[PDB]
Amino acid sequence: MIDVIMTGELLKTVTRAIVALVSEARIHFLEKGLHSRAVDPANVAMVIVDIPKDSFEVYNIDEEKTIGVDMDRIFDISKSISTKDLVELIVEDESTLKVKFGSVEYKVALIDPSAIRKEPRIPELELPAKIVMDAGEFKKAIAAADKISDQVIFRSDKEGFRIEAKGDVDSIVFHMTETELIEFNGGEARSMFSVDYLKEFCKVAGSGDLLTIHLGTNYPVRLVFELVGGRAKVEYILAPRIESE
């Protein structure tokens, strides 16, 4: 009889990150906490969200059950739930999901977890560069590149982490030596991506949070955010745009 209670900002962060690529994903209530991973219909990006049980103001499961949650209606209802308005999720039945907050109890029906596209096996990626920086400084690097182009270049070496965008009349570069990055392993990496997705990922995160970036050469990029003050871990994996010769 799932009976969880999280803060409003917590539910609003995950539902947004998820529904940011899907409209219905399977949510996994495990012993270690809440899990849920999905790829967009396009098959370009992947999101993996984790909420260990210590982020909830209570997390009561009576067996690890998976539920098919209609992410759109959930996200849509979430725009009511307040930031401080504790929300309690309950699934004491098999057909519906009760969402309680304030004097409102919303009840949306559940989906057959196996009725939704089966999620993607979490990749086993081995990437050269590992950059740890602030999500805000990052979100500002993406916002800037969006005015110059549809794509950007993540360039890593020993002299720091670089993100570059070029237009036919201008260019922009976001550089942070290892000395200004929270962490940096200095590995050499270089992959190009579409600002479109990168800008969409940046929505579920703001300044003040941290971000680890796993970059390789002509490989996808892993964007692991510590959201809601380290209470929610949202990872976005974007496929690269390969330089066609």
Binding site: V44, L125, M192, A239, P240, I242, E243, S244
Partner: peptide, 11 residues
């Protein structure tokens, strides 16, 4: 030029 790839190649 550049071609957006898919995640299927890496999974």
């Amino acid at each position: 030029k550049s071609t957006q790839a898919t995640l299927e190649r890496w999974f």
